[PDB]
């Protein structure tokens, strides 16, 4: 059941209703690539939920109370105060780049253990219930290997498990033993987990994981773009916390990490901003080192930062993002879409709190993988309903940088994400209806072939035509 | 069918989800009078659609571009420019009071005809397809009698008619003849018409009405709080204008009036503001007289007026309110609610574009009229779903100012209005479900009796208890 | 000395710098009437300070947190809470019309005393240290005579007195005795007083006045558009309150009135809004009656009111308007301009906190009164520096409504008002320099004569030419 | 002469006026380091003008019209349209990091010439009339040597020259010849130039420089954080363009570069944002490569970017920043402060459009360099007037990373920068008065010594005490 909005809509962004003929011409002009479509020509944009959601009245208002001072800004103080009251963390570093300055804390933590415990850079390995792509990227760029210790139930769509994002506790222990505690720079706890489309991590699991890390004195970083949704799943599925507020669950949750890194463009409800925070004085040196590197990250002083209004807005968003009614509504809407698609026969390889990954291959079996069935489905969805989605298959995969040959892809998927507090149940039904129509006219959908192909990141600007 | 929102929600006002126990206590504290409830304790507030709807991004942004100059404000110029381009009217007077300064143009028009055609104040009569309550009030206060010349099909819920708000052309002609053209100060064309819950007026009807008025040289005022919805109904139901844009229909529509008066708090999408405009130089003296009276209305100079941002916002709202996709969506939502209620057996005495008037008497037959069955229904709807609606029955009617006895009331109705772009299909279904539940437990609902009753306007602050 | 701004400018409204030739053409097109000039063509607009000043960041932000509910709005609650904490008054009625609903409380108070003490409408007289024009207007319109009991020092520009706005305590007592206590519907305490361009009222004077009123049980209404500036003058000039905060002085000040009426467009820093408040339960019936009349003021129900954001903004403005640094700065700027003009030989008939009234007659002696020397000066000031000011002389006075002859005027004055936090010391020096230039080329300035003259309120739209 | 503001102040940020005793305690708590002071305790913050200035009404309003789409955003289109109309550049890349993605175009240009003309990375040298510190940093980090070819008059405070920021045309030619054209990856034209506190570059000089670069086919990048002020100086000092508008001068100016890089936090009037743009198709490959690197700059995909409102705001700011009246006013204010300081005997090593560098050594000769006389002056300025400025001397210089010994410093300077449209002439006079007081009590000011010193970037968080 789709819950009624626990809010009154106050400000809207008009979106024109286009004709089928118009969209047919539009998709052709864009070279059968939704990425090349004008935003105005997209009725329901499911490209991403990162920074594309709505804000509350108080959040928007906060943008006009900014203190733009270079240092000592009351807006920075307000944000740090929210972090202290919400997460219990004493040190806050606002971030305006990718994620939560992962490019910052990673090299800082590696060097810390190298100087204190003789960490060996050639043998170092970092662990996580599941590393986000960028987190894994910065780790590897820094010469650190990563391992995801997720549980057996994680990717098993056949079995139902309350916390599929949980750490494989024995796997983690085994990994540390195997690698050597001196060689483990940090452990990243991602909540909710990005495995299987987004799955929650239980507080019991986080506590157990933290005890293991503490035993070996390994820094624990909470990757928390979706800290609120994880708190909601705990309140909903972990009996012990059934009567706890989202705020209490969050305060308790963060006792089991030493610091946190997060993009504020998800649960925090803002279009820009991030955070890198440290719990207490035990990590004061890590805070100092990170703040310092933030300035000379380029190898010399460089200044930048969120405008005052943005810090005031995030200071409010951290609270509004934890609203119980809101969280129940947001999650119920995502589940409503997934359940609706399943009902009409649409199959997803994985579907969770973050996104649904429709199997375009099964939906359009007559199309060869090399002809990008998921990109064709994306185009068809646009033609039929003006929906824009992202292909996660051979098209995205690209070619071998050394052979120029198409890389092999396990499955041709079409990703559906939902911007927060942006679309309604009617839009969800509109999407479901669109897939029902596509499924019905599947055999008639054509494969694609390049008319223009960039050497790198081809999915963003490549142009194709029907076969 | 409820259409999908032709927009992306951008700003929301959080509303808490309350428990039944909480609402039970709340309604008691408010003395079984929703008017006394805190807005925060109301989940779906259907009290009124006047100034309670959402605004577009451009409209909200306009509030920050205000020119606060006492005279010659570029913001005033922008608003007048919108009126000139949209309605074709050369003279604009922004209003910030009730409706569109009806308290202004009425005395001005009466005096005009009195001086030019020897109008007799003791015999004067004003006509309209249907006078809004306030319009009728200012007319009568000024000593002018009013007559509503609506068509036979107007209040006949048994027959379907495309334009139930139409003028009874022969009735108007007959009335003028009867009263004497010199004694008819003005004719007010209300669009959409407030008869039968809101019904459209055809352009063919307006043209015919204007020819009659022109023949007798009688000023025609377009009461247009809902000018856009009327334009939409014309595009939808009047074949001649099927392919015309809302803008073209509006420009054409206003050729058939000499001036316009409107509250901008409906179709114009703003929380405050109104307009009093004159088409061309033929009414320049009426414009001058109105502007003058605006200043010395109290019998001496008094200054006030919309802030610059409000005029800039309205200048934009007049355009956004005419968006075709928006209008189709808004109207479809209203019809969706009505159709849904009819389906579950809920009966309305009248239902149209403005509101739905549920018959509380038929829904709760065991409750005596004197015990206010519509007020009881209002309370029950709040208890069950946190919905706030307004009683239009014996409670509102009140007592005889000369006898202190309850006045006789034709029907006990509960009014449902829908704030623009504020609630979703899910809320509409929530409302329908609430009525379904009430209908099922009807026999158990109790009547009400006063515990506190004001001498005047008792419906706003009276307190009652169950019998 | 002009104090430095106790604030950082955050948002500006661009104003173009025009050439002398451009302004010469502009003033001609406007018929030698600044009222007819476009705001954009005015560099320094000294027309009025009513709703033309700047707002603080928090005030502007508040506009986006509005609760538009018809009743029970949290925004209304926030405003009432500010009034309760600032003035100590328990009942609040937001106003959106002229001043503070003087058209409301006056008839309510007259009727109250008529029913309770047999007040005689044919003999009733209201008192005030000095009635504002509109206040006097509503009193007289209601058939009530008014008397200003100001002190001897009030209009004496030759003597310096700390509180020229003080009530003539013995005069008030004598007046009540003379008129009869049953016939005195109310006493209005205006702070700061509008006499002599704006003069403060001491707390000692207000206390003494209230004791007199209390003795005769006569309602006291505090007309407080400039309550903050009065509080500042008390802190500056009344020794007893030297170390009290503006907030403490204000709380104490309002113990000496039973209710308050104020336009929020002055000290409260907003472009729109007003207030009508009652101190405690002793005036609950007056509150109820006023709220009721607010609805049926037209003789029937009419709905209107400030939008939610406006109430939230005023809730903040009442506090920001009391900022000590701000008040000292605002007042010092006004005094800076006056002192500067005096230094160059410019003479004012009166000058105070509200405005400076330059004597155009003395500055331009060669121009006959009937040729409007103050209107000529206004035009010259615009030609020379792009300054717009308002004439308060024969031009404004107009003709005898019964003789059509020019009415006799005591002096030809040009009013200078200063919008709050809008202009700088540089603008003040620019204004002073402009007058210095005018004084130097005075003999060459020409008188004016009509080319177009309205029958009423001619000063607003009349057009003239040079003689 | 300080010009009057060509604008009306509309929104203000309150700043409290502190007592001397309060500031004395505050500066001690901050360890005699203004960087550690709360913004609220700073009356006049001259720390930096980067993103600390005011915005216009239209700019602020634009923040509410954002299109947050990941791709095809109408807000991105609006910004690109402004760039095309203002600079004539067809390709736009919005930046949200440091400056204008210098970390992006530098490696792209180096690789371009390496592949096309066999550039030798071990011999490459980049030229500029004067490289900004960050620009020089990214160049060197990329292994590229830099040379500043400024003119002899540049740093000569004894001689007056209209365009001290000019390229040393013969020096540039000689340098390219010396280095070898194949080894010169790019030439950066900084406008206005950061040499000698900010000095303009003439259009004649830019044209001559571009002809030289074009002759050798060397890419020219316009570093234009202050493009508007440079245009203003050209209109003021370069006779040929005396009657040209700032817009025309800017369009002409950019014909002499192939691309532009700029922080929008200066002349563009925004608190955040930057730009990296390419003129035409000749640089389409450079645009494509830069956009690509923008995504995989970390060595893998990372997503981030300005929120829609920020792009809409910058789209407006580029225009408002070119307002002629505004530019004349801004520059006149800076010159007013400098002239005022010179008048009272304060000496600056250099002073220009960007900042004034007061010689603390000469002002406080009794203080040893190692005791940081400029940091002492900064503290004294705060104690006396609540002014916060930045030390540019031994304190900032720091210690030798290899010896731990204090590094030798040429002069002990105190930098004064002025946030745009933030402070008034009164604040400028307040600053001048403060220096007059310091100069008078100079002998009594004490030197400083560390109580806490970080290993790196000590100037930001170090704490000291008086000697
Ligand atoms: Cl706020
Ligand atoms: Cl806008
Ligand atoms: Mg900043
Ligand atoms: Mg106004
Ligand atoms: Mg309202
Ligand atoms: Mg974004």
Residue numbers in the entry:
A (entry chain A), B (entry chain A), C (entry chain A), D (entry chain A): 5 to 471
What does the primary publication say about this deposited structure?
The tetramer possesses a D2 symmetry, therefore it is a dimer of dimers with two different dimeric interfaces: a catalytic interface and a non-catalytic interface.
The two apo mutants of E. coli Trpases as well as the wt Trpase are found in an open conformation, different than that of the closed one found for P. vulgaris in its holo form. In the Y74F mutant, the observed loss of activity at 25°C is presumably attributed to the proximity of residue 74 to the substrate binding site. In the wt Trpase the hydroxyl group of Tyr74 is hydrogen bonded to both Arg103 (at a 2.9 Å distance), and to the phosphate group of PLP (of the neighbouring subunit in the catalytic dimer) through a bridging water molecule. Replacing Y74 by phenylalanine eliminated the hydrogen bonds of the hydroxyl group thereby reducing its affinity towards PLP. Hence, the Y74F mutant exhibited negligible activity compared to the other Trpases. It should be noted that mutant Y74F dissociates even at 25°C (about 17%). Unless the concentration of PLP is higher than 5 mM, Y74F exists as a mixture of holo and apo forms which affects the dimer-tetramer equilibrium.
